[PDB]
Amino acid sequence: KSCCPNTTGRNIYNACRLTGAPRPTCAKLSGCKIISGSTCPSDYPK
Numbered sequence: 001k002s003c004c005p006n007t008t009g010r011n012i013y014n015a016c017r018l019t020g021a022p023r024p025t026c027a028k029l030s031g032c033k034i035i036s037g038s039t040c041p042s043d044y045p046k
Contacts (some may be wrong), residue, residue, distance in 0.1 A: 001035055001036070001037065001038060002023055002026075002027065002028065002032050002033070002034050003031075003032060003033050003035065003040035003041065003042070003044040003046070004030065004031065004032035004033065004044055004046045005033070005043065005044045005045070005046055006030060006031070006046060007030055007046050009030045009031040009046070010030070010046050011030075012026075012029070012030035013026050013027070013029075013030040013032045015030075016017070016029055016030060021032075032044070
């Protein structure tokens, strides 16, 4: 699962991936957290 902190970031993340970029990169570019669990951490509610 690819969660995110701020709403703004979540948006940029989608765009990055929409182009064909990897999860990791986009996660660091926008600021989204990449985990395995099926839930979002308190830190990244978005």
